[PDB]
């Protein structure tokens, strides 16, 4: 563009989207509205718990939960690790990070937080699955 064209219409940068929109929103109950706040995790209640089939070429029964967050947004969260103790009405902590195999699963459920238990029999990378030191 000419300098005159830049002066008339300055350059405009591309806007960046969040990978975890459900964590960027809080809810004010008194005013019954949403509010913009960046959060690293959110509490939620597991509306459903079950398994999903990944997209090709992968094949598996990946464990996930449909969770209502404290801000009233309903999301799918993956359950990492081997074995979990989650059912409907379980209260779980949700963090960002999607599962590439699972199409609509954009969050993870923290292990070893609120109701969710650590992975039983985990000994390497235990902090990633909320397992205490066996000793």
């Amino acid at each position: 563009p000419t300098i005159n064209q830049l002066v008339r219409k300055p350059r405009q940068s591309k806007i960046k989207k969040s990978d975890s929109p459900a964590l960027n929103k809080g809810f004010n109950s008194k005013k019954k509205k949403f509010t913009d706040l960046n959060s690293p995790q959110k509490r939620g209640v597991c509306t459903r718990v079950g398994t999903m089939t990944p997209k090709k070429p992968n094949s598996a029964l990946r464990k996930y939960a449909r969770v209502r967050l404290s801000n009233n947004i309903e999301i799918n969260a993956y359950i990492p690790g081997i074995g979990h103790n989650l059912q409907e009405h379980s209260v779980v902590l949700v963090r960002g990070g999607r599962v590439k195999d699972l199409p609509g699963v954009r969050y993870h459920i923290v292990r070893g937080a609120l109701d969710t238990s650590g992975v039983d029999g985990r000994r390497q990378g235990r902090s990633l699955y909320g397992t205490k030191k066996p000793k």
Partner: protein, 139 residues
């Protein structure tokens, strides 16, 4: 149903307040059940949830998860053919179903002789039987 979160929170607080009052979810029925020391106990707890926690709830007799079984034995066959269109799929099996001894559970036996059914598909036959029996056949 919009008050289910309030109901869960009230149940948690109430279980912390009273050791003898319990609440648990039943997987089979997908119902939440509340156990107490009597009718008066549960009635007071329901009323306290309704008023103090402002969560109106209705209570009833817990649903009973029933089971099915075969009373008579019989040899049976199943044959599925889907060759009419595009890719063609053929399956055929001959299975004797027998009333098992009560409490013994499902038992799959593979009396295949001569490889009439390739050994690759026998586990698939077992898995199909398991799924189909998980789904009820009478009710």
């Amino acid at each position: 149903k919009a008050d289910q979160d309030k109901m869960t929170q009230a149940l948690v607080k109430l279980q912390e307040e009273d050791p003898t009052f319990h609440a648990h979810t039943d997987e089979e029925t997908g119902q939440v059940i509340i156990g107490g020391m009597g009718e008066l106990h549960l009635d007071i707890l329901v009323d306290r949830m309704k008023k103090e926690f402002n969560v109106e709830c209705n209570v009833g007799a817990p649903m009973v998860s029933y089971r099915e079984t075969f009373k008579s034995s019989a040899q049976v066959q199943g044959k599925f053919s889907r060759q009419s269109g595009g890719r063609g799929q053929y399956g055929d099996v001959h299975i004797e179903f027998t009333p098992n001894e009560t409490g013994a559970g499902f038992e799959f036996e593979n009396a295949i002789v001569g490889g009439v059914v390739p050994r690759e598909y026998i586990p698939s036959v077992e898995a199909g039987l398991k799924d189909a029996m998980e789904n009820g056949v009478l009710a």
